[PDB]
Coordinates of C-alpha atoms in Angstrom, one line a residue:
Chain A
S5 CA 127.9 131.5 94.5
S6 CA 126.4 133.2 97.5
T7 CA 127.8 132.8 101.0
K8 CA 124.6 130.9 101.9
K9 CA 125.3 128.2 99.3
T10 CA 128.6 127.3 100.9
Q11 CA 126.8 127.2 104.3
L12 CA 124.2 124.9 102.8
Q13 CA 126.9 122.6 101.4
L14 CA 128.8 122.4 104.7
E15 CA 125.8 121.4 106.7
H16 CA 124.9 118.8 104.1
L17 CA 128.4 117.4 104.5
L18 CA 128.1 117.8 108.3
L19 CA 124.9 115.8 108.6
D20 CA 126.2 113.0 106.4
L21 CA 129.4 112.7 108.6
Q22 CA 127.1 112.8 111.7
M23 CA 125.0 110.0 110.2
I24 CA 128.0 107.7 110.0
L25 CA 129.1 108.7 113.5
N26 CA 125.7 108.3 115.1
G27 CA 125.2 105.0 113.3
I28 CA 128.5 103.7 114.7
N29 CA 127.9 104.8 118.3
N30 CA 124.5 103.1 118.5
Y31 CA 125.9 100.0 116.8
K32 CA 126.1 97.0 119.1
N33 CA 128.1 94.1 117.8
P34 CA 130.7 91.6 119.2
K35 CA 133.1 91.9 116.3
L36 CA 132.5 95.6 116.1
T37 CA 136.0 96.3 117.4
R38 CA 137.4 95.4 113.9
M39 CA 136.0 98.6 112.5
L40 CA 137.4 100.8 115.3
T41 CA 141.0 99.7 115.3
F42 CA 141.6 100.9 111.7
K43 CA 143.8 104.0 111.6
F44 CA 142.8 107.1 109.6
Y45 CA 145.1 109.8 108.4
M46 CA 144.4 113.2 110.0
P47 CA 145.0 116.7 108.8
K48 CA 147.6 118.8 110.5
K49 CA 145.6 121.9 110.3
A50 CA 141.9 122.2 109.2
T51 CA 141.2 126.0 108.9
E52 CA 139.8 126.5 105.5
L53 CA 137.9 124.7 102.7
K54 CA 141.1 124.0 100.8
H55 CA 142.1 121.6 103.6
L56 CA 139.3 119.3 102.7
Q57 CA 141.8 117.4 100.4
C58 CA 142.8 115.5 103.6
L59 CA 139.2 114.3 103.9
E60 CA 138.8 113.5 100.2
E61 CA 141.9 111.2 100.0
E62 CA 140.7 109.3 103.1
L63 CA 137.1 108.9 101.7
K64 CA 137.9 105.6 99.9
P65 CA 139.4 103.9 102.9
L66 CA 136.4 105.2 104.9
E67 CA 134.2 103.5 102.3
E68 CA 136.1 100.3 102.5
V69 CA 136.1 100.2 106.3
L70 CA 132.4 100.8 106.4
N71 CA 131.9 98.2 103.7
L72 CA 133.8 95.6 105.8
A73 CA 131.5 96.1 108.8
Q74 CA 128.1 95.6 107.2
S75 CA 125.7 93.5 109.2
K76 CA 121.9 93.4 109.3
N77 CA 121.7 96.0 112.0
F78 CA 124.4 98.2 110.4
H79 CA 123.3 99.2 106.9
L80 CA 124.8 102.5 105.6
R81 CA 125.2 102.0 101.8
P82 CA 128.9 103.1 101.9
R83 CA 129.6 103.3 98.1
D84 CA 126.7 105.7 97.5
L85 CA 127.1 107.5 100.9
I86 CA 130.7 108.3 100.2
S87 CA 129.8 109.3 96.7
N88 CA 127.4 111.8 98.2
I89 CA 130.0 113.0 100.6
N90 CA 132.6 113.2 97.7
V91 CA 130.6 115.4 95.4
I92 CA 129.9 117.9 98.2
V93 CA 133.6 118.0 99.1
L94 CA 134.6 118.6 95.4
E95 CA 132.2 121.6 95.3
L96 CA 133.9 123.0 98.4
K97 CA 137.5 122.1 97.6
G98 CA 137.2 123.6 94.2
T102 CA 145.4 121.5 93.3
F103 CA 146.3 121.8 97.0
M104 CA 148.5 119.0 98.5
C105 CA 147.3 117.5 101.7
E106 CA 149.6 117.7 104.7
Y107 CA 149.0 114.9 107.3
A108 CA 149.5 114.8 111.0
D109 CA 152.0 112.2 112.3
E110 CA 149.4 110.8 114.7
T111 CA 146.7 108.5 113.3
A112 CA 143.3 108.1 114.8
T113 CA 140.2 105.9 114.9
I114 CA 137.1 106.3 112.8
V115 CA 135.3 108.0 115.7
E116 CA 138.1 110.6 116.2
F117 CA 138.3 110.9 112.4
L118 CA 134.6 111.6 112.0
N119 CA 134.6 114.0 115.0
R120 CA 137.5 116.0 113.6
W121 CA 135.8 116.7 110.2
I122 CA 132.5 117.2 112.0
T123 CA 134.1 119.9 114.1
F124 CA 135.6 121.3 110.9
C125 CA 132.3 121.9 109.3
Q126 CA 130.8 123.4 112.4
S127 CA 133.9 125.6 112.8
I128 CA 133.4 127.1 109.3
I129 CA 129.6 127.4 109.5
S130 CA 129.8 129.4 112.7
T131 CA 132.2 131.8 111.0
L132 CA 129.9 132.1 108.0
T133 CA 127.1 133.2 110.3
Chain B
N1 CA 122.1 93.6 93.3
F2 CA 119.7 90.6 93.3
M3 CA 116.2 89.3 92.6
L4 CA 113.6 87.9 95.0
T5 CA 111.5 85.2 93.4
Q6 CA 108.1 84.5 94.8
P7 CA 105.5 82.0 93.5
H8 CA 102.9 83.9 91.4
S9 CA 100.1 82.4 93.5
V10 CA 99.4 80.2 96.5
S11 CA 96.0 79.0 97.7
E12 CA 94.4 77.0 100.5
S13 CA 91.0 76.5 102.1
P14 CA 90.1 78.4 105.3
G15 CA 91.6 77.2 108.5
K16 CA 94.6 75.5 106.8
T17 CA 98.2 76.7 106.6
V18 CA 99.9 78.3 103.6
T19 CA 103.5 79.2 103.0
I20 CA 104.9 81.8 100.6
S21 CA 108.6 81.5 99.7
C22 CA 111.0 84.3 98.8
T23 CA 114.2 83.2 97.1
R24 CA 117.2 85.5 96.8
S25 CA 119.2 85.1 93.6
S26 CA 122.5 86.6 94.7
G27 CA 124.1 87.0 98.1
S28 CA 123.1 85.5 101.5
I29 CA 119.5 86.2 102.5
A30 CA 120.5 86.1 106.2
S31 CA 122.8 89.1 105.6
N32 CA 119.8 91.5 105.2
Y33 CA 116.5 91.8 107.0
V34 CA 113.4 90.5 105.0
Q35 CA 110.1 92.3 105.2
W36 CA 106.6 91.1 104.1
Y37 CA 104.0 93.5 102.9
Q38 CA 100.3 92.8 102.5
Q39 CA 98.4 94.7 99.8
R40 CA 94.7 94.8 99.2
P41 CA 93.4 95.7 95.7
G42 CA 93.4 99.5 95.2
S43 CA 95.0 100.0 98.6
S44 CA 98.5 100.8 99.9
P45 CA 100.8 98.1 101.3
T46 CA 100.9 97.4 105.0
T47 CA 103.5 95.5 107.1
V48 CA 102.7 92.0 108.4
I49 CA 106.3 90.9 109.0
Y50 CA 109.4 93.1 109.4
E51 CA 113.0 92.1 110.2
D52 CA 112.7 88.4 109.2
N53 CA 110.2 87.4 111.9
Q54 CA 109.1 90.5 113.9
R55 CA 105.4 91.2 114.0
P56 CA 103.8 94.7 114.3
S57 CA 101.2 95.4 116.9
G58 CA 97.8 94.7 115.3
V59 CA 98.9 91.9 113.1
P60 CA 97.4 88.5 114.1
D61 CA 99.6 85.8 115.5
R62 CA 98.7 83.7 112.4
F63 CA 101.5 85.6 110.6
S64 CA 105.1 84.5 111.1
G65 CA 108.3 84.9 109.2
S66 CA 111.4 82.7 108.8
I67 CA 114.7 82.5 107.0
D68 CA 116.2 79.4 105.4
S69 CA 120.0 79.7 104.7
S70 CA 120.1 76.4 102.9
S71 CA 117.7 77.3 100.1
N72 CA 118.6 81.0 100.4
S73 CA 115.0 81.8 100.9
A74 CA 112.6 83.7 103.1
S75 CA 109.1 82.3 104.0
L76 CA 105.9 83.8 105.2
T77 CA 103.6 81.3 106.9
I78 CA 99.9 81.9 107.7
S79 CA 98.1 79.4 109.9
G80 CA 94.3 79.2 110.3
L81 CA 93.7 80.8 107.0
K82 CA 91.0 83.5 107.0
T83 CA 89.3 85.3 104.1
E84 CA 90.8 88.6 105.2
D85 CA 94.2 87.0 104.5
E86 CA 93.3 86.9 100.8
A87 CA 95.6 89.5 99.2
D88 CA 98.8 90.1 97.4
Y89 CA 102.0 89.5 99.4
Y90 CA 105.4 91.0 98.7
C91 CA 108.7 90.0 100.3
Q92 CA 111.3 92.8 100.5
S93 CA 115.0 93.0 101.4
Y94 CA 117.9 95.3 100.7
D95 CA 121.5 95.4 99.5
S96 CA 124.5 97.7 99.4
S97 CA 123.3 98.4 95.8
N98 CA 119.5 98.9 96.2
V99 CA 116.1 97.9 97.7
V100 CA 114.7 94.8 96.2
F101 CA 111.0 93.7 96.1
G102 CA 109.7 90.3 95.2
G103 CA 107.5 89.7 92.2
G104 CA 104.5 89.4 94.5
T105 CA 102.3 86.5 95.4
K106 CA 98.5 86.4 95.2
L107 CA 97.1 84.5 98.1
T108 CA 93.7 83.0 97.5
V109 CA 91.4 81.7 100.2
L110 CA 89.4 79.1 98.5
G111 CA 85.6 79.8 98.6
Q112 CA 84.9 77.6 95.6
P113 CA 86.6 74.5 94.1
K114 CA 89.5 75.2 91.8
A115 CA 88.6 75.7 88.1
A116 CA 90.8 75.2 85.1
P117 CA 90.7 78.1 82.5
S118 CA 88.8 77.8 79.3
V119 CA 91.1 79.0 76.4
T120 CA 90.0 80.1 72.9
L121 CA 92.6 81.1 70.4
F122 CA 91.8 83.1 67.3
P123 CA 94.1 83.4 64.3
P124 CA 94.5 86.8 62.4
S125 CA 91.3 87.6 60.5
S126 CA 91.4 87.8 56.7
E127 CA 90.3 91.4 57.0
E128 CA 93.2 92.4 59.3
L129 CA 95.8 90.6 57.1
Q130 CA 94.7 92.6 54.1
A131 CA 95.3 95.7 56.2
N132 CA 98.9 94.6 56.5
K133 CA 98.4 93.7 60.2
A134 CA 98.0 90.6 62.3
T135 CA 96.6 90.0 65.8
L136 CA 96.3 86.7 67.6
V137 CA 93.6 86.8 70.3
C138 CA 93.9 84.4 73.2
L139 CA 90.8 84.4 75.4
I140 CA 91.0 82.9 78.9
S141 CA 87.9 82.5 81.1
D142 CA 86.3 80.7 84.0
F143 CA 89.4 80.0 86.1
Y144 CA 89.9 80.1 89.8
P145 CA 92.0 81.2 91.6
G146 CA 92.5 84.4 89.6
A147 CA 96.1 84.0 88.6
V148 CA 97.5 82.7 85.3
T149 CA 100.7 82.9 83.3
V150 CA 100.6 83.3 79.5
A151 CA 103.4 82.2 77.2
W152 CA 103.3 82.3 73.4
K153 CA 105.0 79.9 71.1
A154 CA 106.0 80.2 67.4
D155 CA 106.1 76.5 66.3
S156 CA 108.2 75.4 69.3
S157 CA 110.1 78.6 69.8
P158 CA 109.1 81.1 72.6
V159 CA 107.7 84.5 71.7
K160 CA 108.0 87.4 74.2
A161 CA 107.9 90.4 71.8
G162 CA 104.5 91.8 70.7
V163 CA 102.7 90.2 73.7
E164 CA 100.1 92.2 75.7
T165 CA 98.3 90.4 78.5
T166 CA 95.5 91.7 80.7
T167 CA 95.4 91.2 84.5
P168 CA 92.6 88.7 85.5
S169 CA 89.3 90.2 86.6
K170 CA 86.4 88.7 88.5
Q171 CA 83.4 87.6 86.5
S172 CA 79.7 87.3 87.6
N173 CA 80.3 83.7 88.8
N174 CA 83.2 84.9 90.9
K175 CA 85.7 83.2 88.6
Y176 CA 88.2 85.1 86.5
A177 CA 88.7 86.2 82.9
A178 CA 91.8 87.4 81.0
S179 CA 93.0 87.9 77.4
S180 CA 96.4 87.8 75.7
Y181 CA 97.2 89.5 72.4
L182 CA 100.1 88.6 70.1
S183 CA 100.9 91.4 67.6
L184 CA 102.4 90.1 64.4
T185 CA 103.3 91.2 60.9
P186 CA 101.5 89.1 58.2
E187 CA 104.9 87.9 57.1
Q188 CA 105.8 86.6 60.6
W189 CA 102.4 84.9 60.8
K190 CA 102.8 83.1 57.4
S191 CA 106.5 82.3 58.1
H192 CA 105.5 79.8 60.8
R193 CA 103.7 76.4 60.7
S194 CA 101.6 77.3 63.8
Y195 CA 101.4 79.6 66.8
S196 CA 100.4 78.6 70.3
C197 CA 98.9 80.2 73.4
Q198 CA 100.0 78.4 76.6
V199 CA 98.1 79.3 79.7
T200 CA 99.5 78.0 83.0
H201 CA 97.2 77.8 86.0
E202 CA 98.0 76.2 89.4
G203 CA 100.9 74.4 87.8
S204 CA 98.8 73.0 85.0
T205 CA 99.1 74.2 81.4
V206 CA 96.3 74.6 78.9
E207 CA 97.4 75.0 75.3
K208 CA 95.6 76.1 72.1
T209 CA 97.1 76.2 68.6
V210 CA 96.2 78.0 65.4
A211 CA 97.8 77.7 61.9
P212 CA 98.0 80.0 58.8
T213 CA 95.6 78.1 56.5
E214 CA 94.0 80.4 53.9
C215 CA 91.1 79.2 51.9
Chain C
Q1 CA 99.3 110.5 113.4
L2 CA 102.1 110.5 110.8
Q3 CA 100.6 110.5 107.4
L4 CA 102.1 110.8 103.9
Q5 CA 100.4 112.2 100.8
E6 CA 101.6 112.0 97.2
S7 CA 100.8 114.9 94.8
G8 CA 101.1 114.5 91.1
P9 CA 99.5 115.5 87.7
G10 CA 97.5 112.3 87.3
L11 CA 97.8 112.6 83.5
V12 CA 101.1 113.3 81.7
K13 CA 102.2 112.8 78.1
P14 CA 105.3 110.7 77.1
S15 CA 108.8 112.2 76.9
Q16 CA 107.8 114.8 79.5
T17 CA 109.2 114.9 83.0
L18 CA 107.0 113.6 85.8
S19 CA 107.0 115.8 89.0
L20 CA 105.7 114.3 92.2
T21 CA 105.7 115.7 95.8
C22 CA 105.2 114.0 99.1
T23 CA 103.8 116.0 102.0
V24 CA 104.4 114.9 105.6
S25 CA 101.7 115.7 108.0
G26 CA 101.3 114.9 111.7
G27 CA 105.1 114.6 111.6
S28 CA 108.2 116.3 110.3
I29 CA 111.5 115.6 108.4
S30 CA 113.4 116.7 111.6
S31 CA 115.5 113.7 112.4
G32 CA 118.3 111.6 110.8
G33 CA 116.5 108.5 111.9
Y34 CA 114.8 108.0 108.5
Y35 CA 115.2 107.9 104.7
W36 CA 112.3 109.4 102.7
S37 CA 111.5 107.2 99.7
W38 CA 109.6 106.9 96.5
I39 CA 108.1 103.6 95.3
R40 CA 105.9 102.9 92.2
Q41 CA 103.7 100.0 91.0
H42 CA 102.8 99.5 87.4
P43 CA 99.1 98.4 87.1
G44 CA 98.9 94.6 87.6
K45 CA 102.6 94.3 88.3
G46 CA 104.8 94.3 91.4
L47 CA 106.4 97.0 93.6
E48 CA 109.6 98.8 92.4
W49 CA 111.8 101.0 94.6
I50 CA 112.7 104.2 92.9
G51 CA 114.9 105.9 95.5
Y52 CA 115.1 107.7 98.8
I53 CA 116.7 110.8 100.3
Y54 CA 118.3 111.7 103.6
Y55 CA 117.3 115.0 105.3
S56 CA 120.9 116.1 104.6
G57 CA 120.0 116.0 100.9
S58 CA 122.0 112.9 100.0
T59 CA 120.2 110.6 97.6
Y60 CA 120.1 106.9 96.9
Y61 CA 118.6 105.5 93.7
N62 CA 117.6 102.3 92.0
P63 CA 120.4 101.4 89.5
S64 CA 117.8 100.7 86.8
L65 CA 116.3 104.1 87.3
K66 CA 119.2 106.2 88.5
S67 CA 119.8 107.9 85.1
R68 CA 116.2 109.1 84.9
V69 CA 115.3 110.0 88.5
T70 CA 116.1 113.0 90.8
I71 CA 115.0 113.3 94.4
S72 CA 115.1 116.5 96.5
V73 CA 113.9 117.4 100.0
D74 CA 112.4 120.5 101.6
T75 CA 112.8 120.3 105.4
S76 CA 111.2 123.8 105.8
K77 CA 107.9 122.7 104.3
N78 CA 108.3 119.1 105.4
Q79 CA 108.1 117.8 101.8
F80 CA 110.3 115.8 99.5
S81 CA 109.8 115.5 95.7
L82 CA 110.7 113.3 92.7
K83 CA 111.4 114.0 89.1
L84 CA 111.2 111.3 86.5
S85 CA 112.4 112.4 83.0
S86 CA 111.4 111.2 79.6
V87 CA 108.4 109.1 80.7
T88 CA 106.7 106.5 78.6
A89 CA 103.7 104.2 78.9
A90 CA 106.0 101.9 80.9
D91 CA 106.1 104.7 83.6
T92 CA 102.3 104.6 84.1
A93 CA 102.0 103.5 87.7
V94 CA 100.7 104.2 91.2
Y95 CA 103.5 106.2 92.8
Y96 CA 104.0 105.8 96.6
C97 CA 106.0 108.0 99.0
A98 CA 107.1 106.2 102.1
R99 CA 109.4 106.3 105.2
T100 CA 112.1 103.9 106.1
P101 CA 114.6 103.8 109.1
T102 CA 118.3 104.4 108.6
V103 CA 121.1 102.0 109.6
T104 CA 118.7 99.3 110.9
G105 CA 117.7 98.4 107.4
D106 CA 115.2 99.3 104.6
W107 CA 111.6 98.9 105.8
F108 CA 108.8 101.1 104.5
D109 CA 106.4 102.3 107.2
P110 CA 104.2 104.1 106.8
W111 CA 103.2 104.3 103.1
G112 CA 101.3 107.2 101.5
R113 CA 97.9 106.7 99.9
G114 CA 99.6 106.5 96.5
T115 CA 98.7 108.5 93.4
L116 CA 97.9 107.0 90.0
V117 CA 99.9 108.5 87.1
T118 CA 98.6 107.9 83.6
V119 CA 101.1 108.4 80.8
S120 CA 99.5 108.7 77.4
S121 CA 99.4 111.0 74.4
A122 CA 96.5 109.4 72.6
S123 CA 93.9 111.5 70.8
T124 CA 90.3 110.3 70.5
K125 CA 90.2 107.4 68.0
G126 CA 87.5 105.1 66.8
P127 CA 88.2 101.4 66.8
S128 CA 88.6 99.1 63.8
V129 CA 86.4 96.0 64.0
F130 CA 87.6 92.6 62.7
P131 CA 85.5 89.4 62.6
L132 CA 86.7 86.4 64.6
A133 CA 85.4 83.6 62.4
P134 CA 84.5 80.2 64.1
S135 CA 86.0 76.8 63.6
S136 CA 86.2 75.0 60.2
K137 CA 84.3 71.9 61.3
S138 CA 80.9 70.7 62.4
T139 CA 80.8 68.6 65.5
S140 CA 77.6 66.7 66.5
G141 CA 76.1 68.6 69.4
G142 CA 79.2 70.7 69.7
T143 CA 79.7 74.4 70.2
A144 CA 81.6 77.0 68.2
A145 CA 83.3 80.2 69.3
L146 CA 83.0 83.3 67.2
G147 CA 83.7 86.9 68.0
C148 CA 84.6 90.5 67.2
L149 CA 88.0 92.1 67.7
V150 CA 87.6 95.8 68.7
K151 CA 91.0 97.1 67.9
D152 CA 92.9 100.3 68.6
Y153 CA 90.5 102.8 70.2
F154 CA 90.7 105.6 72.7
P155 CA 89.4 106.2 75.2
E156 CA 87.3 103.8 77.2
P157 CA 84.6 102.6 77.1
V158 CA 83.3 100.5 74.2
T159 CA 79.9 98.8 74.3
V160 CA 79.4 95.6 72.3
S161 CA 76.0 94.0 71.6
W162 CA 75.0 91.1 69.3
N163 CA 72.1 91.1 66.8
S164 CA 71.1 94.5 68.2
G165 CA 70.7 93.0 71.6
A166 CA 68.7 89.9 70.5
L167 CA 71.7 87.6 71.3
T168 CA 72.8 87.6 74.9
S169 CA 73.3 83.9 75.8
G170 CA 76.9 82.8 75.6
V171 CA 78.1 86.3 75.1
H172 CA 81.4 87.2 76.9
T173 CA 83.0 90.6 76.3
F174 CA 86.5 90.7 77.8
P175 CA 88.0 93.7 79.5
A176 CA 90.2 95.7 77.2
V177 CA 94.0 95.5 76.9
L178 CA 96.1 98.7 77.1
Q179 CA 98.6 98.5 74.2
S180 CA 102.0 100.2 74.5
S181 CA 100.8 102.7 71.9
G182 CA 98.3 103.9 74.5
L183 CA 95.3 102.5 72.6
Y184 CA 92.8 100.0 73.8
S185 CA 91.7 96.7 72.3
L186 CA 89.0 94.2 73.5
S187 CA 87.2 91.2 72.2
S188 CA 83.7 89.9 72.5
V189 CA 82.8 86.3 71.8
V190 CA 79.7 84.2 71.6
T191 CA 79.4 80.5 72.2
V192 CA 76.8 79.1 69.7
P193 CA 75.7 75.7 68.5
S194 CA 77.9 74.6 65.6
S195 CA 74.8 73.3 63.8
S196 CA 73.5 76.9 63.5
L197 CA 76.6 78.0 61.6
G198 CA 76.0 79.3 58.1
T199 CA 72.2 79.3 58.6
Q200 CA 72.2 81.8 61.5
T201 CA 73.4 85.4 61.1
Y202 CA 75.8 86.8 63.7
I203 CA 76.5 90.5 63.8
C204 CA 78.3 92.4 66.5
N205 CA 77.3 96.0 67.1
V206 CA 80.3 98.1 68.3
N207 CA 79.6 101.6 69.8
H208 CA 82.3 104.0 70.8
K209 CA 80.7 107.3 71.9
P210 CA 83.9 109.3 72.4
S211 CA 84.6 109.1 68.7
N212 CA 81.0 108.8 67.6
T213 CA 81.8 105.4 66.1
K214 CA 79.2 102.9 65.3
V215 CA 80.2 99.7 63.4
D216 CA 78.2 96.6 62.6
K217 CA 80.4 93.7 61.6
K218 CA 78.9 90.5 60.3
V219 CA 80.8 87.4 61.5
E220 CA 80.5 84.5 58.9
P221 CA 82.0 81.0 59.3
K222 CA 85.5 80.3 57.8
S223 CA 85.7 79.2 54.2
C224 CA 87.4 76.0 55.2

């Protein structure tokens, strides 16, 4: 639809990704390191919406990593949260084949990357 | 997803100590924080205990929360019972699936001695049966505290369908009254030897029975 | 002070879609620190979580209500709303909007005042009165319970007197029950001496002004 709708969908995605990031950073746990060591596949280039395939394919492991680290203090509802992230991605990505970087990263770097991605596109749309 | 099972009612005299249990049906109860809400009639719920045992500023020290991993339950304990503590209490926790409330517990601060309910059960009237309808009227009165459970029985078999039960309301004598209606077809009524109205109050059950005897 | 206020129709007919809106005052939907929730409570029953929304727009629902609910948020007006489709009498409840922290766990503070939503599509209807005949025996110095069934009427109230008001002792008129059909039914009973059965006339006078219904039903002892 309008250029504004894409902008609205991106910030929706952005905020959800930031929710996960901010939740993790403020998380304080002894066995928290288990969640951070896990490697995530990264996009080689994230320039346009079509590159969101790299995020989509990594959504399920993102869910599973978050699901594994679910204590009293850390409650994010991964299944529903990712589903919310997923349906937004599909509205944006809408058969490109994801190309991945050779270097893997942690969940923090993974989140920051796609957070930067949304911000990069939004700034251009404005 | 799970259920939180609370007793329907608990009661003690002023100054004593009462405990309301909250049992989780599925999953460990120590895995998720348990909250306790107090609700006065016609009013919004307020927090008395959050995060298992934390107490908001303004809530008396009489309120305390605990978690029992063995029985998979959460308990709200009130010491030095006061009349202001008389209210409904809801335990609440959460899951990866959803937010789960308990069934609720009516706490009664005894101002008068406990009274067993008086139960009167009426069979379908001849006039109603001729109208191809049937209603069994179970009238419950003069009980305290104001919390009862009503179960209907066809012969010896449980009946859940066609049952409408009122919530107990205060009488003039500060006791409570309630009524339960079992909607039936004339055929269902005649097809059984007897129907029963079972009223459970404070663990005790009062039962009345009627039979389809036309004459 | 942060205060929440629910806004609804108060009265809605079945199969329609219930639209509610919560207004945040003395505060704003300006941080990711909270979820914004809807909770309801059927009259005389317990609390039931409906769902909540994050200020991003992402929603989280109750599995049992997911297929019927839809929650949206308006950060500009600091409001979030709820839509509950195809309502029935089972959806009659006091609906609360509330706030709960994220990450730390689900804990609702504060709550709104709550708004009562009544779901019914019942026209004005007069009651049918059926006699509740007393026992079939005569016990020495015993009492007998007789009454009137005031069945299927709308709306409240219904007044019940006995012998045009001459009989008041032992009279107990119970609060009505709300049937799933949306119609009310109550019962009034009198405890009388069993020795007075057959010789004494007992008549209940039912008056339902909304339908201009006046019915006098004589309650005679059972034939047994």
